[PDB]
Curated annotation (Swiss-Prot), chain A:
This is Small ribosomal subunit protein uS4. The keyword RNA-binding applies. HAMAP family: Ribosomal_uS4_B. GO terms for molecular function: rRNA binding; structural constituent of ribosome. The gene is rpsD. It comes from Mycoplasma pneumoniae (strain ATCC 29342 / M129 / Subtype 1) (Mycoplasmoides pneumoniae).
Curated annotation (Swiss-Prot), chain C:
GO terms for cellular component: cytoplasm. GO terms for biological process: ribosome disassembly. Belongs to the TRAFAC class translation factor GTPase superfamily. Classic translation factor GTPase family. EF-G/EF-2 subfamily. It comes from the Bacteria. SUPFAM superfamilies: EF-G C-terminal domain-like, P-loop containing nucleoside triphosphate hydrolases, Ribosomal protein S5 domain 2-like, Translation proteins. GTP binds at residues 14-21, 78-82, 132-135. This is Elongation factor G. Keywords: Cytoplasm, Elongation factor, GTP-binding, Nucleotide-binding, Protein biosynthesis. GO terms for molecular function: GTP binding; GTPase activity; translation elongation factor activity.
Swiss-Prot record, chain D:
GO terms for molecular function: rRNA binding; structural constituent of ribosome. Keywords: Ribonucleoprotein, Ribosomal protein, RNA-binding, rRNA-binding. GO terms for cellular component: ribonucleoprotein complex; ribosome. It comes from Mycoplasma pneumoniae (strain ATCC 29342 / M129 / Subtype 1) (Mycoplasmoides pneumoniae). This is Small ribosomal subunit protein bS20. GO terms for biological process: translation. Binds directly to 16S ribosomal RNA. HAMAP family: Ribosomal_bS20.
Length: 203, 80, 682, 77
RNA sequence: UCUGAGAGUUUGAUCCUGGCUCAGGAUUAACGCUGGCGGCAUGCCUAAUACAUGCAAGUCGAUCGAAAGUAGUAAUACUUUAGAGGCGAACGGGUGAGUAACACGUAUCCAAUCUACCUUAUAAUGGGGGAUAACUAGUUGAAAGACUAGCUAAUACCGCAUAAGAACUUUGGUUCGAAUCAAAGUUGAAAGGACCUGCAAGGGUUCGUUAUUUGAUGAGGGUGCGCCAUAUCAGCUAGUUGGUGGGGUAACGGCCUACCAAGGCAAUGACGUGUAGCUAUGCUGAGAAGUAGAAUAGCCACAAUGGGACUGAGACACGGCCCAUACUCCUACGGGAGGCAGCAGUAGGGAAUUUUUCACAAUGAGCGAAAGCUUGAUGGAGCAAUGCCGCGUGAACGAUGAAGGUCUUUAAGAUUGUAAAGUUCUUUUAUUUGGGAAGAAUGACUUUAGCAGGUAAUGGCUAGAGUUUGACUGUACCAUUUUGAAUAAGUGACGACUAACUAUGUGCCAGCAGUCGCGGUAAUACAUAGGUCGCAAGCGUUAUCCGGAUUU
């Protein structure tokens, strides 16, 4: 779902989080088991390579709030150019607008960044942007449409976040610039991307 | 027109006035985009001479454009 | 182009066999001086095809028939498409603004003119009186006027008088004007006036006394002139008659024999003069849709407003929607919207439909009635507005037919295409309902005599190419049999890969106090409890089909007196399988008695034709020994069986000349006699 | 729909009659030459058929074929 | 950098040959549940079945006579067409029944083909006659009209003469079945209109006529190779096969005809039969290949069925002509009118696939010198979750888990669940107010200046400015533009095949399913409840071809 509205269930079932860890704040029991009611001693019924491939696929996809058909479209465009497609998929996925928006320290979550972008609260190349499905190119800036610079959330979270090493920003004017491609060893990830590459058999 | 709705297209194509659009022809002279007009047109400037020298004068709507490019001046040299 | 004073929307609304069809036919014949009709000379060379009244009325009805006169062009409509109906004339008089009703002179009890007369009396729409029969037996003026005044009591004011007896009519009198002579026979094509002699001057004075004496309620200066004796001008007295007409309190009577076509043009002059113009009379005061139902009207202005009332179907074109243009001179070809249904109905061609052809006029003036082509989703009641004006719903009274005939076609595919056609027919012409009951599958239709179903089958077979034969009303009865003593239900078979067994003994007791209840009389536990609940349901699944034909067994108690099974055998289903078996056998012995649906019939009668009604009710197995009256009219209640009331509907209709209707309500189910149960099986 | 097709419907009939007349005199000259072969008949055929070949009745190919086949028998003397 | 996924099933167990299904993509697609939004794309696969109504190619008065009008005694300036005449109606537009064959596709040759109109130069645009429509008159009739006499005009028609060059035959130059180049005989051309300079004089200028000469364009013609199945189709064939002479085609040829003569093709599949629009390509596969040949484009085919022919450069002609046949419509019954496989639309069939729509603003075509006119081609609009794609139903804080469901069935506790209750932020979309472009600087028109064979001028070409053409649209986009999370979730599965489990009811019963098969008292496999997972504004369901499949 493009807007799930419930992420804690996915976090508990997958043991992962989009942030470092903020989806367990002791509001009751802090349990790392699966949500719902299926028995706390059961794990699953089928645990083959298909199961773990699917599990990692859902993890990677739901870490970005993307739909499966658009993911297949992205893979199809990835097959155009060649190289180390395993890390190239990550590099292209991170080039989406909201990903770099978080990497800019603008907003903690991609969902919040999408909400900001869609409602017309972002300017890029003197054109209004309403979708994060933009293939960012090296050497592009992003403005903030200073009328909407009065958003309390971005103003508060500009300093209290972490800036990725492959991006820069003059957060005083709240404008950032893409420096270079992202790297695997600089971002927090442990996903077996080979499973993602092998699973999709549409191509 | 050809191409895309609200984004028209018409290739500058060598053809004789006998058939419909987008069919049999002889040569592909070039193309013009009316969607962005800044006095520029894809013209070979050489094959158009051969097309003009064997009859089959182009579509009437391009005469001013060819005069802007400078093809009429060198084409009327025959009648000089 | 035209002045709204000239254009007029009138019509003829009268009972059949009183000349309504004939007078409309001949009026179109002799008034065809406009090329759309052109019947005056082009109907004499051709031979007029006379087939029936049904087909001619179906294919000649034109909601907009425009005729040209000296200055004023008229637009007429012939609404009555049945023996008599209330909602069709409701729509018509709601959209039209002129009523001409004829009086009977052959079967002069006036059955179906009185109904429309009372409707108009409650409607208060301008209406005039004319008589088709003048040169025929039983068609004298004095008896007619005396009878209508005595019975109806509407304060009519006849103005013109005939010359001669009811068969030697040879001249026409106008009370304020000269006398009309005749050069030829009918067709009234030559007009000339001559002075009046004493032999007519006496009646001129006599009837002018009544003419000007009653008009005293208008412009008292006329009363002063009558007191003085000075001659009163025609203009002022006719304006007073105009005021009376627009006030809907004065009703003049015309003369002429339209059956042999004497007195046509003077009728035109009288109706165009006495009746108001659609520009001087305010439009129909309808209630809007805002939360108040306030009265609104555009007064023939720019905003196009229209309420759908007639929707006919025709091949090669589609849906022809006869609607009234209350206001707005619109364009031929647009996209109007209706808010109550939220869909842009397409305006493709605004046409006038005539008897022999069609004519699509480019623009139609406000206050007119016309058809539109297309309109694929039109339902009667929607407001057609696209000039930024709120919608409206005019509703004062409506009626739905309850006279029911239960029939069935003779082929399955015939039934399918009949359903496909009747859904569209109900979508286009709401004048009846349709019911499908799960008894066997039957169309319970709403009719008005046999003629309604004849129109149904005609409009089906002539257009849709369908073969169909109507059926008889088929209904069921409930069942209840004698309380037995014992039954012997045995199940013996080696099947199912195991042992199948069951031994059931039940005394079956029907009750009329409560519904079904199961009683367990197995005290020793010889049968398991877990095997009881299914076979219970089996009886509950066998209470729908009896032992004779499947008649409904309703609210019957079951008490399992004795039973036995096999410890390692006797599969459970066999129990319920046996449950229907034994219940049949003893059920055959029980000889059940039926339970018929008894209903109540409320009939309002003027207490002058109650003999036939009471005799028919007595013949229909009812209890009648007197009357119960609502202090001025008798509304008799009768207990009736449903098995014979369907024919009784039309029997009562014909016995009372259609003057008395009724309403059906469900009373209860009552015990049957043996004369009903001997018909239970063939 | 169509408004001037009847113009061509009545136009061709008289022209067709004229062309039939030209063809008939051509055939008469050809038969006269076939009766006996001599220079004057061939010259008359030329003078009366070249005008027909000028206009659109008989193409010049058939005219050339006819005169070649006539001069063949003329030279067969 | 690039090229190949398996699993289940017959037996007590195992191996092996072999078959079936599932795990993949997809459409001319449909069904059931639903249901924000934009762009793009797509929308009779069946009945080549009939088709109501309107629209579907006309144009030229600067071609002609005749006829009306505006103002003007008259001359006249202009708008029009009933007709003649000229051009174009042979294009464009659709539909796939026949056709299994030089039809198509492909490379080619026409010592066998025309090519109006466009490009090149050239001999030139001489002179008369007779014509007939409209109109006038007379019959007939409801109109319809037709019939019969009279008058007219041309770029309509037919003669008179002049010819470079052509055509035709004799003589001589000359060719890898025929062609070049000389002299001669023979023979054929028309038509004017608009404008300028002039008193008249003539000349010039623009269109155009006729004989040419040039290419190009388009069409035709035969051959090489390739291009469905069937042997439960063995011989097929008589203008069929060939020579001679004639005719004829646009040309070459039994294409036709008179005589004469008797083979051609075949087992390497003729011939008969069944099926079928071919091709680029769509889809699948890595590929060899398989499948269908929807849009789109080229070709042929036909235009109610079947025969013919006239017209014109181009037809045997989608809406020209005649006839026959079937069908259908009107009629005052005298006689007529008609062909939606053109655009929408109607009937019927089928499960089923759109509105009886706005304009030539862009492009093309036809005519015209042009102002321009016709354009159901076309550009649009609209319907249609039919497909693809972006896009929303918000976002951030907020319990030892609010209430409650469910479970634990035994409460103690878990779960639904940061989801919610509540706090803050915000308006894609929504509602309201305003500004509001591009698509068209395209074509002409008019004033300026220049160019050209040229003149006294006027006309053609280029450079400059102004006039304008927008159906779409109040579109897009933005704007202290108002309000407020407000206006916005479904559908399949949860035994294994292939991802996620428990309770209750149901007792080989009700019932499930693509496969294994479950249910005879505990069903994780039925019904239902809670929870969970797989996709997503779609989700699943059956049918088609492909992969899996070395299962041709």
């Amino acid at each position: 779902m493009k807007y799930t509205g419930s992420i804690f269930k996915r976090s508990r079932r997958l043991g992962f989080s989009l942030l470092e860890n903020n989806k367990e704040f002791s509001k009751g029991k802090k349990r790392k088991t699966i949500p719902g009611q299926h028995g706390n001693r059961f794990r699953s019924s089928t645990m083959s390579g298909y199961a773990q491939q699917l599990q990692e696929k859902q993890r990677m996809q739901y870490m970005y709030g993307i739909t499966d058909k658009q993911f297949r479209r992205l893979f199809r465009l990835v097959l155009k150019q060649r190289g180390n497609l395993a890390v190239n998929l990550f590099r292209v996925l991170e080039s989406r607008l909201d990903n770099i928006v978080y990497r800019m320290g603008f907003a903690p979550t991609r969902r919040s960044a999408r909400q900001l972008v869609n409602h017309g609260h972002v300017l890029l190349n003197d054109r209004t942007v309403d979708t994060p499905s933009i293939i960012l190119n090296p050497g592009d800036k992003v403005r903030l449409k200073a009328k909407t610079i009065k958003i309390p959330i971005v103003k508060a979270a500009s300093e209290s976040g972490v800036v990725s090493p492959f991006v820069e920003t003059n957060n005083k004017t709240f404008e950032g610039t893409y420096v270079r491609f992202p790297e695997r060893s600089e971002l927090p990830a442990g996903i077996n991307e080979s499973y993602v590459v092998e699973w999709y058999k549409r191509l | 027109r050809m191409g895309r709705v609200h984004y028209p297209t018409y290739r500058i194509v060598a053809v004789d006035s006998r058939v419909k659009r987008d069919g049999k022809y002889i040569a592909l002279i070039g193309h013009l985009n009316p969607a962005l007009k800044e006095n520029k047109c894809k013209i070979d400037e050489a094959v158009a001479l051969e097309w003009l020298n064997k009859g089959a004068k182009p579509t009437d709507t391009v005469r001013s454009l060819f005069s802007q490019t400078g093809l009429w001046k060198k084409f009327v040299e025959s009648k000089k | 182009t035209v002045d709204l004073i000239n254009f007029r929307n009138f019509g003829i609304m009268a009972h059949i066999d009183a000349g309504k069809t004939t007078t409309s036919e001949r009026i179109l014949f002799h008034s065809g001086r406009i090329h759309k009709i052109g019947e005056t000379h082009d109907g004499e060379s051709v031979m007029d095809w006379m087939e029936q009244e049904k087909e001619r009325g179906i294919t000649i009805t034109s909601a907009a028939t425009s005729v040209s006169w000296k200055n004023c062009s008229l637009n007429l409509i012939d609404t009555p498409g049945h023996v008599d109906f209330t909602v069709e004339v409701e729509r018509s008089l709601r959209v039209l603004d002129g009523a001409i009703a004829v009086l009977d002179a052959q079967m002069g009890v006036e059955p179906q003119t009185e109904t429309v007369w009372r409707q108009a009396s409650r409607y208060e729409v301008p209406r005039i009186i004319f008589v088709n029969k003048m040169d025929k037996t039983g068609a004298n003026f004095e008896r007619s006027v005396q009878s209508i005044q005595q019975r109806l009591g509407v304060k009519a004011v006849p103005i013109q008088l005939p010359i001669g007896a009811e068969n030697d009519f040879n001249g026409i009198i106008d009370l304020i004007e000269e006398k009309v002579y005749f050069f030829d026979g009918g067709k009234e094509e030559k007009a000339e006036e001559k002075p009046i002699p004493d032999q007519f001057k006496d009646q001129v004075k006599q009837m002018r006394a009544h003419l000007v004496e009653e008009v005293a309620n208008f412009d008292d200066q006329l009363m002063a002139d009558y007191l003085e004796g000075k001659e009163i001008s025609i203009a002022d007295i006719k304006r007073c008659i105009r005021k009376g007409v627009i006030g809907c309190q004065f009703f003049p009577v015309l003369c002429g024999s339209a059956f042999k076509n004497k007195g046509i043009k003077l009728l035109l002059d009288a109706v165009v003069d006495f009746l108001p113009s659609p520009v001087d009379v305010p439009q129909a005061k309808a209630y809007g849709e805002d939360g108040n139902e306030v009265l609104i009207s555009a007064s023939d202005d720019a905003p196009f407003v229209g309420l759908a009332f007639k929707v006919a179907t025709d091949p090669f074109v589609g849906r022809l929607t006869f609607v009234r243009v209350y206001s707005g001179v619109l364009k031929s070809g647009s996209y109007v919207k209706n808010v109550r249904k939220n869909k842009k109905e397409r305006v493709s061609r605004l046409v006038k439909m005539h008897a022999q052809n069609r004519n699509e006029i480019e623009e139609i003036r406000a206050g007119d009635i016309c058809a539109i082509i297309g309109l694929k989703d039109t339902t009667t009641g929607e407001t057609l507005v696209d000039d930024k004006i709120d919608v409206q719903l005019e509703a004062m009274q409506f009626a739905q037919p309850v006279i029911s005939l239960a029939v069935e076609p003779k082929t399955k595919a015939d039934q399918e295409k009949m359903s496909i056609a009747l859904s569209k027919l109900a979508e286009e012409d709401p004048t009846f309902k349709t019911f499908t009951d799960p008894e066997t599958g039957q169309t319970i239709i709403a009719g008005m005599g046999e003629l309604h179903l004849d129109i149904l089958v005609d409009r089906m077979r002539r257009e849709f190419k369908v073969e169909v034969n109507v059926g008889a009303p088929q209904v069921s009865f409930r069942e209840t049999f004698n309380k037995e003593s014992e039954v012997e239900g045995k199940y013996i078979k080696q099947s199912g890969g195991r042992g199948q067994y069951g031994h059931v003994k039940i005394r079956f007791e029907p009750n009329k106090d409560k519904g079904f209840e199961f009683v367990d009389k197995i005290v020793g536990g010889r049968i398991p409890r877990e095997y009881i609940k299914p076979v219970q349901a089996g009886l509950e699944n066998a209470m729908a089909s009896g032992p004779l034909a499947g008649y409904p067994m309703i609210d019957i108690k079951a008490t399992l007196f004795d039973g036995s099974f096999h410890e390692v055998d006797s599969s459970e289903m066999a129990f319920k399988i046996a449950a229907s078996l034994a219940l049949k056998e003893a059920g055959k012995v029980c000889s059940p008695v039926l339970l018929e649906p008894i209903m109540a019939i409320e009939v309002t009668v003027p207490e002058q034709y109650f003999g036939d009604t009471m005799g028919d009710i007595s013949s229909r197995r009812g209890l009648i020994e007197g009357t119960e009256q609502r202090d001025n009219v008798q509304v008799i209640k009768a207990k009736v069986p449903l098995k014979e009331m369907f024919g009784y509907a039309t029997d009562l209709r014909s016995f009372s000349q259609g003057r008395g209707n009724y309403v059906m309500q469900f009373s209860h189910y009552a015990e049957t006699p043996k004369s009903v149960v001997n018909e239970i099986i063939a | 729909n169509i408004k001037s097709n009847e113009k061509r419907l009545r136009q061709n009939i008289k022209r067709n009659l004229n062309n039939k007349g030209q063809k008939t005199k051509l055939k008469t000259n050809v038969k006269n030459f076939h009766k006996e072969i001599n220079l004057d008949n061939l010259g008359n055929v030329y003078s009366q058929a070249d005008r027909l070949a000028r206009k659109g009745i008989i193409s010049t190919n058939r005219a050339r074929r006819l005169k070649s086949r006539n001069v063949a028998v003329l030279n067969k003397t």
